[PDB]
Amino acid sequence: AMLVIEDVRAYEVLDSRGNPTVKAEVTLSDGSVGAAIVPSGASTGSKEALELRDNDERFGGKGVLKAVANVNETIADEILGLDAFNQTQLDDTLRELDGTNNYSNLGANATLGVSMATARAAAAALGMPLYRYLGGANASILPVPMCNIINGGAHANNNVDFQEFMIMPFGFTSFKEALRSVCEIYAILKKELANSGHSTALGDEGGFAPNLANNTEPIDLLMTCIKKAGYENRVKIALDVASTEFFKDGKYHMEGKAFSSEALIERYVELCAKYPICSIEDGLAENDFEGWIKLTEKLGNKIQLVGDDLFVTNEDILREGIIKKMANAVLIKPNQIGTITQTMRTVRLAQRNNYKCVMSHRSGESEDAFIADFAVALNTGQIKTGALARGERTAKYNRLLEIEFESDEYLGEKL
Amino acid sequence: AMLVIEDVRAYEVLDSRGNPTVKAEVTLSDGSVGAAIVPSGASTGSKEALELRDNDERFGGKGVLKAVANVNETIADEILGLDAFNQTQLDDTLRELDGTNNYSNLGANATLGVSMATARAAAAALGMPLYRYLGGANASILPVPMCNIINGGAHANNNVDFQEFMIMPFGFTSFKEALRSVCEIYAILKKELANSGHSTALGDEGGFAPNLANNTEPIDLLMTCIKKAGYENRVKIALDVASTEFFKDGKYHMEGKAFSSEALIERYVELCAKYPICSIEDGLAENDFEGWIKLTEKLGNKIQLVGDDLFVTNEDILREGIIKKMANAVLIKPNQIGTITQTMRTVRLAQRNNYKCVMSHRSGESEDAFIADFAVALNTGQIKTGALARGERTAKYNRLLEIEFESDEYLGEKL
Amino acid sequence: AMLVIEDVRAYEVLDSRGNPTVKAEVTLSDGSVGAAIVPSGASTGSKEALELRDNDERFGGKGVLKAVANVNETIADEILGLDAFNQTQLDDTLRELDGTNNYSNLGANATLGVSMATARAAAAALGMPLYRYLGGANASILPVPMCNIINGGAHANNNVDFQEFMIMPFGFTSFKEALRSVCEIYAILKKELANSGHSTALGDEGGFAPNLANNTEPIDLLMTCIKKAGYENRVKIALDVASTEFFKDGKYHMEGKAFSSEALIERYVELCAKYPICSIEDGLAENDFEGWIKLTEKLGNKIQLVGDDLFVTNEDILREGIIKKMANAVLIKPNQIGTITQTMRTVRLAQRNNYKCVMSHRSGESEDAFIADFAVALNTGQIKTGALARGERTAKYNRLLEIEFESDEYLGEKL
Amino acid sequence: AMLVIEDVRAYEVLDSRGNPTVKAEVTLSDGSVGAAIVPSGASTGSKEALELRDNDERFGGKGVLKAVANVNETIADEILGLDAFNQTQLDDTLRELDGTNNYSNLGANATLGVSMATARAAAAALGMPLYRYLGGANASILPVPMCNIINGGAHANNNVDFQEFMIMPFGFTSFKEALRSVCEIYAILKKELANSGHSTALGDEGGFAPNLANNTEPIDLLMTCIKKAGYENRVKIALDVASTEFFKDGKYHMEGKAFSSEALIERYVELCAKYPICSIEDGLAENDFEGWIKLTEKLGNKIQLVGDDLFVTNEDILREGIIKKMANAVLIKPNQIGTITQTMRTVRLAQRNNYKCVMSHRSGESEDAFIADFAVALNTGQIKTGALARGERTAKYNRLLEIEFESDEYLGEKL
Ligand SMILES: [Mg+2]
Ligand SMILES: [Mg+2]
Ligand SMILES: [Mg+2]
Ligand SMILES: [Mg+2]
């Protein structure tokens, strides 16, 4: 082995909502250090990989001291002396040590931080950028971002049922010019809101949560801001419906109605005919398997249909989805699965079977921009990393602006 | 010269509000690299160091391509080959190259970034943390934070005159426990706001801007939340009144009145008698010199009186203030003055003359945590770096949690 | 730049058929050296990147002294001092230096060798295997080989119209066992041929060219050998028809008849219904656009349809093929396009649009196993590199056996 | 010891006929790596050093898993920590560890791999070409190749008795021009066979096996091709009769007859009177001692007489040959004897006693070109490494073309 893991440590830091999370730091035998901050995920649930939370008097039960302990003691003891450069061996060792199928022992907050930290340490020792370490010279594509600038659903307290209303800048030949257009549109939206007596205060991802009437008003507002900014036809709309949040008893409860699966599908067809929606995430619920099958038949050749809660970044669940023809794209949330290698597996599966991958943030983020490198490393072509404000979101865009001096490839509207 | 500056560059990145700002990167002759991002400043005004803005069609007038060109061409040409370790010579060269008394040639956004980036590159060459590079083995004190968790004034659209309502965790023997307290109190406040029908969406610094009635309602709310959290007597209140914003025709226009300077002082005496306010910033206007003299006589021995707009991190203006006995503390905003050395000169003058220094963020921040290390390097004992949310604020608290593993001295209530 | 290209040279070597070709060697500023040998291409044609041949009295007009001089003089002069690790800038520089759309100035045999040699040199400098240099930690899949063990058409002198009859070992969980199976099937074929009085002497790719009656006898013989070897149901059949070779006057002349495009497609339907054929390459001619659209409608959901002459590894021609729905896979011959970057672009375009990539050899190969690393770097999942004999074929299989000790993932029949 | 052997391993790869062989890899304590592939030999026999073969269900009984194990376990355990640069000590240790006179224990395929691999690793550590490591600055002579371009005997299934019909380019002042002459002659031979209805498919060493009528018809064809190519009198003919293959009950069964030793000798005399045959290998059988003595007396001062099966590269057998005046040259096959030092011992014996050495390939070769370096290292002046086709042959020619840029000395016709 060329270099080995010499030291590993973790400690408690704060995420962008002010809750604790794990930072890990790995030192190699040449003295190269890498570190990484894990975004916040879910500590209960039977599908997702689980993060460990302390549930004691500190920080409202949200301390991560046990996750931190598991890195400093259990993981440390198992990985010191492993080859720094064999990411797959490190990640498989983490899985085997945990011994469950959802990291319910070590905690995904313990395993991901160590997984990302080791990769960074390896890249540092080679003097190479992280995206080159993860994806080689083939790492090239700067992703088209989808930028959540108007919020509703559970992400707000309004009458808007849909969770995320996003703008996507396709009509550009460079990432920086694309980034500039969404920045300009966001500024215009802020003004439009202020001038009609709405709050300009921000939600967790940097977007606005004004109390609008329904699910089409926010779209109309995006359209008029896009046009006023001078980008008509070059910026399109993406939605995250998060339909599991309002699915009860076989029905979807929105817009004062109780919708059937088939009726909600017809609603999306309607919306897609009237507005330049290019993508819809979680249009149907995470267990509405029959509905998704229909959704994909009706719209899967016209628009992107992204599984988030449907697939939870999980290779096996995505495989069954691929087989049964559900969706045509998958949100990629690395902490949801627990190591960089398992994330890569899910992405490779999707890309071998015509599913697009959207590298994704979490609601509780950090200053760590790992997912900007990851999106380029795997040529995802898409990233979902927030509005154009709040440092835990702008850190990712800034990283992508850096990577752009070395590899400036942006697909925009090109195949 | 041991190592020399070998390369200097800059490029446009985004600050935490979605406006462009400068990131600079300096490479030394051993290959060590340092980078820094500059927070947003003022591009107009007659007192402060000015940042350069392009004022063209991009980003609503706020592009920084001229500043960036100033790093890439003008500064680079001048500093290539200078001793990496002579910060003072670097910063003095920048001042001379600029040739003005307010950086209105190079732009303070061009000079600060290079000043910061060179310091990080020198610390990296030595394998030393930034705070050790800046302040040596004498760097020791983890500062007490003042955290802006309720906003008013120009920072919101309410009936509240004062700008910032802050909590300061004095009653603790460690920084980690001090920070926990403010995080717990912030979470409690978030919940109180939500249950009382206020928005929990955030202002620029991560605080809330509810439409409250007056200037004491916000204080009462902080007090309730402090006690509910279990930290009664251990956490005090600081204010930024930003009184220049309501000073007109010799009078202060607040609480539906027109106060003379004398009347406003006795109002502060009242407030300080009723509540545990330990610090008031810009209690009087930036040009109300007579008022400041009287205020300082009246409360200067009981509470901290911070000059922000009064001093603008400027050594000369501070010197006159000391001589005239105005204030007993100074807010330190490095980008206001334009280099690290000029910042250190202002701090040293203050500390030689019994004025406390509060190391400060700006409204437009980034993921760069320089001011955390800077606060420790200079033993300021206090920092003002935002609420306990938004990554551009939590990055500083996190950096302070890392520094604490090497130097854990927290003064708290100790002399 | 960490390391820069310090030296570039070339010289004439011999390919696996005894003709000259270009060997290039690149030295970096730390002393690291990479070398590569270019497979032989086409010095005429209207679509392909051209290789320069001397056309003098040496080597029957096939000298490459002008290609060699282009590396030693023109390319060298231009790329000395360029950043070793920026493959894309290297390859874009080679393209621009050339100035044409098909390397008809420098020659693709001049540019590919330097392109590959720089990549090997950068990988050696980092102590990294080439596949990790090219595809990072994400480089993982060992490809399923398609092995050309019976020949016909222009690659023989017989009644067989089709050019290549190949076996593909799908039914295995490891590459080594898959490879053993095809070696075992190959040895059995050899014995069967010898016992029937056929020659066991080899064509250019290591396969046999017995004088068989038609296009189905070779397939019947492959099935018999698959079964005797013990691998029934685990090894499938792939074909390269190379139909352009018998396309004349809008018809295909084979099996003693003149087929319409439509009639030839129906022959493939019949063949596929009777035999386990998983892939057909150049089933229709390189210019039979309407036929390919029909073929792809008819069989593209059931079998792999590989464009070789159709696409000539060219991203622009492939892109039109995607838009026009022709084929669902593409043969990747790096020397056909001229740089490793242009190769990666064609592969990325393919993989974004649901086309499979088959990393391929040429008839004139060398001991250079670059395409083995390249297949793994880009997770192509498939490779065509010859029969299981002749060192210029076995060098690639051996390289894949070496890569297998570091990443052993073999998909086989898995999605 | 400047460096020591730090790691030793082996694994199965494929030879050029598609059978397993051993690849060995040796790493030194500076991290320098050397690797080597063993050509195929004999698992049985009472004269040659033996290669170990598995004899189980894998690869028709040709697996080398036991050889591989002997490298990874027995050898490794014995040589780890030995001086990297003491080639003689390493090779003697291998011989001692084996404890037989014919490597029947470890297997010659286990020991030669390690022997070559260590030499390459030492050369790499010194930054020197292998031929310099083995032969120093005195290593100079590029060998005259004998190129087997028409096959008979056991190497085909024709009515041709002799095994190899070779061309040798003496009439040139550079190796490259000699190599070009043989490439051009081979191309002309290919055309001649294709126009007279013969197969152009290749045998194991890259030559053709047309069904000719006797042993002079092939020579006639070589002469025609030499003259048509324009190289008359500059290229000569060398034969390998491999007469042991047809020797039985005292006599030599060829051309429908049983020849006495003396009659076969008179046949060589006739053949050498009529054609420019400069060398004959194994003209008489391996145990026909009285015959060899007469053949040597008769033609030994006129033509080269090479022992292959007569001497099996074995020092002791050659020594007795020298004493009894049998042959005037020895074929040198390193895997036949089992280490580089032992190979060297045999060559030095020969060169001290006026025996010419022909560095030789095996019919199961690999991409490894060790024997090209070895020929130059020892100034053999002659090499037999196949036809001008197939990668496992052209790899050697190419390596000699590389060495020619550093040492261009070619004797050709000079003493
Ligand atoms: Mg979602
Ligand atoms: Mg202030
Ligand atoms: Mg083809
Ligand atoms: Mg022989």
From Swiss-Prot, chains A, B, C, D:
One of its GO terms (molecular function) is magnesium ion binding. PROSITE patterns: ENOLASE. One of its GO terms (cellular component) is extracellular region. GO terms for biological process: glycolytic process. Pathway: Carbohydrate degradation; glycolysis; pyruvate from D-glyceraldehyde 3-phosphate: step 4/5. The keyword Electron transport does not apply. Signal peptide: none annotated. InterPro entries: Enolase (IPR000941), Enolase-like_C_sf (IPR036849), Enolase-like_N (IPR029017), Enolase_C (IPR020810), Enolase_CS (IPR020809), Enolase_N (IPR020811). The keyword Metal-binding applies. Its EC number is 4.2.1.11. It catalyses: (2R)-2-phosphoglycerate = phosphoenolpyruvate + H2O. Mg(2+) binds at residues 240, 281, 308. (2R)-2-phosphoglycerate binds at residues 163, 333, 362-363, 384. Its cofactor is Mg(2+). Keywords: Cytoplasm, Glycolysis, Lyase, Magnesium, Metal-binding, Secreted. The active site is at residues 205, 333. Binds a second Mg(2+) ion via substrate during catalysis. It is found in: Cytoplasm; Secreted; Cell surface. Belongs to the enolase family. Catalyzes the reversible conversion of 2-phosphoglycerate (2-PG) into phosphoenolpyruvate (PEP). It is essential for the degradation of carbohydrates via glycolysis. This is Enolase. The lineage of its organism: Bacteria, Pseudomonadati, Campylobacterota, Epsilonproteobacteria, Campylobacterales. The gene is eno.
